[PDB]
């Protein structure tokens, strides 16, 4: 409703860096809000795409941002009569970024890895890797939980069980208020998908450079399965956290699996021990139900609610014809120990191929009425197909069925305006929570400032 669509702020990165593929707000130890932006195709030292991360100070004028520097050199360690190798070329550093406390977590889902023992090899595979930085102190650390040293022949004997070679850890990410990093790895367990969790503090204390393979005892990975319903499900395509069991000491995980059960798609709510509490099934196959998940209390009853995006849902229309538009599902948490029922509200896109629901950002309470609100992205929507971000306001019964404000892309065609979103943070310190929108196709990020209600 009360985002300012007239005077925007534009931050920008190098041409073709996909600056804005991922973003988040970052408060330093003093509370000053900056913007962290990942550019997964930034050039490295060898003039090869390795990705990059930028830390943007808040200025109403926007502009260029300084880099958040990470190591981009390939590593090699000859240890244990073996040879460990990391390959950062086209790793996509900055394909997901997330902030917690004064720490930034930027991930390279496609960082490759291999191990050589004489003539055998583990196979050069994309295990993924996340880089962690404390910008004020200059501390750095890495976390790559899927790196292994098992040779290729072994996996064949055991029928590829516990195969974490293609995890792409860091594909999606989130951090619990307690400070436990949670990485989605959609390729883990031969493309079933796994999650990896580990306290940020322990990642730093257990990391040393050049070790490449180290233990993080306090970590916790999800589990392989022999159930074909999970096969090629990309469990961990998206991740989020919330409170869903009534126990405030436990933190619950929400996982997207948009190709679960033969592309039916699914979303699962688990406890911290990866035990399944509820499961939401996709409504339509290949709709990619689970592409994005969002957790926020929208009806002001204190119980977090669940939103799931299915950006390729095909809506029924006259004459038995369908139309890919995308759909968003709202699930309201019921009082006490009970299962999440049918969706309380269905939001469906309008523009063909618009991919409504590609991203879903909790906004907090935008208009300050006591009900939290959300923003939904249709990165190829609007009458021009340039992209649209739609705001829906919370109410006592859930959300409003019609949007309160629509943001049209200020970029040219192909910018993927809205492909990444992030809200619920007050960046100019005017008492109102603001919205940052990524448009990696245009290598820019747009900041919308919330203003008092008119």
């Amino acid at each position, epitope marked *: 409703l009360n985002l300012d669509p007239v005077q925007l702020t534009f931050y920008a990165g190098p041409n073709g860096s996909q600056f804005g593929f991922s973003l988040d707000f970052h408060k330093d130890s003093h509370g000053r809000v900056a913007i962290v932006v990942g550019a997964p195709r930034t050039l490295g030292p060898s003039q090869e795409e390795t990705g990059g991360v930028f830390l943007c100070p808040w200025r109403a004028e926007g502009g260029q941002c300084p880099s958040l520097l990470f190591d981009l050199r390939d590593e090699t360690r000859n240890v*244990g009569s073996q040879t460990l190798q990391t390959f950062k070329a086209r790793q996509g550093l900055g394909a997901s970024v997330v902030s917690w406390s004064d720490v930034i977590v930027a991930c390279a889902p496609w960082q490759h890895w291999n191990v050589l023992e004489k003539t055998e090899e583990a196979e050069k595979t994309p295990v993924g890797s996340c880089f962690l930085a404390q910008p004020e102190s200059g501390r750095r650390a890495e976390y790559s939980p899927c790196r292994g040293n098992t040779l290729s022949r072994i996996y064949v004997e055991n029928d590829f069980s516990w195969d974490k070679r293609y995890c792409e850890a860091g594909f999606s990410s989130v951090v619990t208020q307690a400070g436990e990093l949670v990485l989605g790895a959609p390729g883990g367990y031969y493309f079933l998908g796994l999650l990896a969790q580990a306290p940020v503090a322990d990642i730093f204390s257990s990391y040393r450079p*050049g070790i490449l393979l180290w233990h993080v005892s306090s970590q916790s990975l999800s589990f392989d399965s022999s159930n074909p319903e999970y096969f090629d499900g990309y469990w961990g395509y998206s991740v989020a956290v919330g409170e869903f069991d009534g126990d405030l000491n436990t933190t619950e995980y929400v996982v997207g699996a948009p190709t679960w059960s033969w592309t039916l798609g699914a979303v699962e709510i688990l406890d911290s021990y990866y035990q399944r509490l509820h499961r939401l099934r996709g409504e339509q196959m290949a709709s990619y139900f689970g592409h994005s998940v969002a957790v926020t209390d929208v009806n002001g009853d204190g119980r977090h609610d669940l939103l799931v995006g299915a950006p390729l849902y095909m809506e029924s229309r006259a004459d038995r014809k369908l139309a890919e538009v995308g759909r968003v599902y709202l699930f309201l948490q019921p009082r006490g120990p009970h299962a999440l029922g049918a969706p309380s509200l269905l939001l469906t896109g309008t523009q063909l191929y618009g991919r409504f629901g590609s991203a879903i950002a909790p906004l907090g309470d935008l208009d300050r009425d006591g009900y939290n609100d959300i923003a939904v992205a249709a990165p190829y929507g609007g009458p021009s197909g340039r992209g649209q971000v739609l705001v829906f306001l919370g109410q006592s019964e859930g959300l409003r069925s019609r949007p309160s404000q629509v943001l049209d892309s200020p970029f040219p065609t192909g910018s993927a305006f809205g492909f990444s979103l992030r809200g619920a943070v007050d960046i100019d310190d005017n008492g109102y929570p603001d919205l940052i929108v990524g448009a990696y196709g245009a290598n820019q990020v747009a900041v919308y400032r919330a203003q008092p209600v008119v």
Partner: antibody, heavy 119, light 108 residues
């Protein structure tokens, strides 16, 4: 905390066999590699072998192939070292080792199991 | 196998001294070396891993250094507890091999 509690001292005859134990305390034995190291006053320290208790795969120094047999039961969270056809030269102190962070290191050590072979 | 020549075999020193133990390998091991301590009539405790990194709980007066095939363990200001045995172990290749050992003795 991480502690490796081994079996009591053993007192055996030549030609017999013995099975030492290394029980994990404060962690899961399945987490890391588990090595076995032999110590003598003259010959010093010698590396016997290792095992990955998650899968049971083992590596050995060619010097101990035949005498040393390393196993692991994740149920009782314990790693074992079996020695066969014992000899006066097999009289030594035996330690189980695991790394702290580095997959390949040798950082945490059990107290050591004393072995004496004699008729 | 990789031969670990550790030197010296022993040294007579006093409290507060700054001493250095060395370890020479038959070939390069690229900092894949650990250092160990065995207080008299007791077990082992880890000091260094990957050449320079302190094991959690070890005082900062310890410090490892070196590269290629020549490494060093240094103790700044000896404490009464530091009089013990010290060994170097390489894990660059299987089988792991240990150095001869170094005993720190009180000087008088």
């Amino acid at each position: 905390e991480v502690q490796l509690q081994q079996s009591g001292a053993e007192l055996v005859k030549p030609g017999a066999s013995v099975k030492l134990s290394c029980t994990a305390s404060g962690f899961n034995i399945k987490d890391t590699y588990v090595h076995w190291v032999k110590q003598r006053p003259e010959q010093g320290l010698e590396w016997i072998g290792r095992i990955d208790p998650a899968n049971g795969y083992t590596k050995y120094d060619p010097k101990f192939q035949g005498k040393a047999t390393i196993t692991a039961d994740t149920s009782s969270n314990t790693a074992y070292l079996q020695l066969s056809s014992l000899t006066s030269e097999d009289t030594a102190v035996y330690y189980c080792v695991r790394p702290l962070y580095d997959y390949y290191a040798m950082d945490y050590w059990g107290q050591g199991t004393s072995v004496t072979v004699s008729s | 196998d990789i031969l670990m020549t550790q030197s010296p075999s022993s040294m007579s020193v006093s409290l507060g001294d700054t001493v250095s133990i060395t370890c020479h390998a038959s070939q390069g091991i690229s900092s894949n070396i650990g250092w160990l301590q065995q207080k008299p009539g007791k077990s082992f405790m880890g000091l260094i891993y990957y050449g320079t990194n302190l094991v959690d709980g070890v005082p900062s007066r310890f410090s490892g250094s070196g590269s290629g095939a020549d490494y060093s363990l240094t103790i700044s200001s000896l404490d009464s507890e530091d009089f013990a045995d010290y060994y170097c172990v390489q894990y660059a290749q299987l089988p792991y091999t240990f150095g001869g050992g170094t005993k720190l003795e009180i000087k008088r």
